[PDB]
């Protein structure tokens, strides 16, 4: 286990670009990490954005978030894909939250950002 609740990370999921997140406990499993049905470790994350979104993400697609400028180093992991405006706008909002979260303590981030789940 490389990440704990409140850690800031980048997550790469499906068709989405590397996205700023906060590791969090799954609202049902009450764990932030697990071994999946293929035998691989995953982490539970909240994506930073205007709309609350969460996912279980494979450990190979989770990276420590040190700052927004790391994005260039992640793409590298010339021909470049364009940045679709609608997604770019949502990603910019997410990054603004992650940049504010970076200035907080782990306890502050947990208090400030942990989602509330309603049945
Ligand atoms: C980055 C990302 C990956 C990703 O897998 N999902 C899923 C999560 C479950 N619900 C469907 C969408 N949403 C996002 C996302 C995009 C923009 C704003 C916020 C989050």
UniProtKB/Swiss-Prot annotation:
The chain holds residues 266 to 396 of 1437 of the full protein. Highly expressed in brain, heart and skeletal muscle. Expressed at lower level in liver and lung. It is found in: Nucleus; Chromosome. Histone methyltransferase. Preferentially dimethylates 'Lys-4' and 'Lys-27' of histone H3 forming H3K4me2 and H3K27me2. H3 'Lys-4' methylation represents a specific tag for epigenetic transcriptional activation, while 'Lys-27' is a mark for transcriptional repression. Residues 5-68 form the PWWP domain. It is linked to Defects in NSD3 may be involved in non small cell lung carcinomas (NSCLC). Amplified or overexpressed in NSCLC. This is Histone-lysine N-methyltransferase NSD3. The KIKL motif recognizes and binds the NET domain of BRD3. It comes from the Eukaryota. Belongs to the class V-like SAM-binding methyltransferase superfamily. Histone-lysine methyltransferase family. SET2 subfamily. Transmembrane segments: none annotated. Interacts with BRD4. Interacts (via KIKL motif) with BRD3 (via NET domain).
């Amino acid at each position: 286990v490389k990440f704990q609740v409140g850690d800031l990370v980048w997550s790469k999921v499906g068709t989405y670009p590397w996205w700023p997140c906060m590791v969090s406990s799954d609202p049902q499993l009450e764990v932030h990490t697990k071994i999946n049905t293929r035998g691989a470790r995953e982490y539970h994350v909240q994506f930073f954005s205007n709309q609350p979104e969460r996912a279980w993400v494979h450990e190979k697609r989770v990276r420590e978030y040190k700052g927004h400028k790391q994005y260039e180093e992640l793409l590298a992991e010339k021909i470049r894909k364009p940045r679709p405006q609608r997604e770019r706008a949502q990603w910019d909002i997410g990054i603004a939250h992650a940049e504010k979260a970076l200035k907080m303590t782990r306890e502050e981030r947990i208090e400030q950002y942990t989602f509330i789940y309603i049945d």
